Amino acid sequence: DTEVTQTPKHLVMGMTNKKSLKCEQHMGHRAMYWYKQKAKKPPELMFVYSYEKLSINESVPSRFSPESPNSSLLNLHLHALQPEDSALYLCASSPLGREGLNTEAFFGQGTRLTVVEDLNKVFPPEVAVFEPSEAEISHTQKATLVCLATGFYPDHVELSWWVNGKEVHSGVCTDPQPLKEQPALNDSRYALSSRLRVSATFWQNPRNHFRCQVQFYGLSENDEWTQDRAKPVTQIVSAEAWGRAD
């Protein structure tokens, strides 16, 4: 995918947690970068590190305390964030060359960060799988299964289909964007759908098992929880359907 290794892909945090965004490259590049990106805007430069020098473009650098133990690492140390710091955080590196002309940048996968003011608003998804229509099978000899992940907040889910124990990408379409379940509220919970379409012959076999699994990113162990309901930790939520003979 990329030679710039950035973790985690997703992160949910409260206003008092401390967490590191890790970024590593072994290409010998001589400059590394952090950008942040708000939805539907260009990446905005935060920090550059190159030849022992941290350059600061971020207005509140103490919230991010970048550190580079060596030229292969540029990590962010998050502390005391505000909800407006929710953004995509993108690490990059550039080879520069020997006289600094090679300024093309190679990016990592980014960290999608949501900062939540009230951790009691965090909810994992409910997940359900719906079996194909027999009428679709009769008309097309194809079978579309649907997975719905609903009621989750914030919007940090990764949905995958697993057929007889192995992940499947062919024949899958997952919504690019989630739906707001109440589009008129700022803290609305979200829903996401996915389709898996297979030949009718594959679906019509009771020994074939179809699982939709959703990785939800939520609270970590260093997040305090005092509510009666179960702590909404980062977790997998699953649902499964078995094939149905003709």
Next chain:
Amino acid sequence: QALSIQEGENATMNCSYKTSINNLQWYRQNSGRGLVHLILIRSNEREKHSGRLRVTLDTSKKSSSLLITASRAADTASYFCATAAVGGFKTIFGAGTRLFVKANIQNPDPAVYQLRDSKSSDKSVCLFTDFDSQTNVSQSKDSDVYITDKCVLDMRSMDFKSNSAVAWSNKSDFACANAFNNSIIPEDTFFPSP
């Protein structure tokens, strides 16, 4: 800054910058592949070729154009200009352009199907599928009814692409038979006898 074309047509996007530069570079961003460097042109060059891409640079009034010939569905993305100074300390992105490339559907077969109820769910679920890329799916106009946008699905096993949207509700008056009626439904939409 939004451009929508049919698959195979050309895509031309523009950008401008405010300062002196050593070079300008175009980037592509989507969730499929992330933020990717496309092409780099120096401030002493006027045009560059690489594959289906050609970039122009007009330093005279600080503008650049990116042209993609023979666009394919995969080109759907946000495109951004970055300008860079020698030494790497001022590599800065400007305003982007969102590019949508609609893929042609060779065998349309628009239909609305009701999926089977899940024993673990109170929802009824409807599928609008196999419509051509000229069809737009309208959002839900009712509170407890949810309708997704269209999703393009590639059945690589059969070299078969299809569009689909999903609608669902747990309300007793929800019906697949008219779930999608706020959309313009193709007159040849199939509503199979159950």
